[PDB]
Amino acid sequence: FASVYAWNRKRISNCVADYSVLYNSASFSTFKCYGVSPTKLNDLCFTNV
Amino acid sequence: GGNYNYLYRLFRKSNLKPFERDISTEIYQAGSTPCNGVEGFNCYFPLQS
């Protein structure tokens, strides 16, 4: 991964991804989200990320 | 008035009936898989100052 001043972009769309398999994963130091309930992440549809 | 004597009850998943008394000042833990995959974690105080 690049430096903070040259942080890396990527565009993701037309996917079917599950966050539950990632939410329960314990290999993360911190996972806190703003205004979005993680358990409902599988019940929303977005244009892109 | 008290600087930290007023606190609110950050909670979800258990929508309550109208005019319901909620004095359950209990630590929010599940002790099962949907809390960091183990027992005793994601045990954060729902009460917030």
In total, the C-beta contacts within 8 angstroms joining chain A to chain B are: 11
**Quoted resolution (Å):** 3.6
Residues in Cβ contact with B8 at an 8 Å cutoff, skipping those fewer than 6 apart: B47, B48
The whole-angstrom separation of Cα B33 and Cα A24 is 8
The whole-angstrom separation of Cα A37 and Cα B34 is 13
Q: How many CB atoms lie within 10 A of CB B30?
A: 14
Q: How many CB atoms lie within 10 A of CB B45?
A: 12
Interface touch A24/B37, C-beta < 8 Å: yes
Phi, psi of B33 (to 5 degrees): -60, -45
Residue B41 distance to chain A (closest CA, Å):
11
Interface touch A37/B36, C-beta < 8 Å: no
The whole-angstrom separation of Cα B47 and Cα B27 is 9
Method: cryo-EM
- Residue A18 Cα distances to A5, A33, A40, A41, A42, angstroms: 30, 16, 11, 8, 6
Interface touch A39/B34, C-beta < 8 Å: yes
The whole-angstrom separation of Cα B13 and Cα A44 is 17
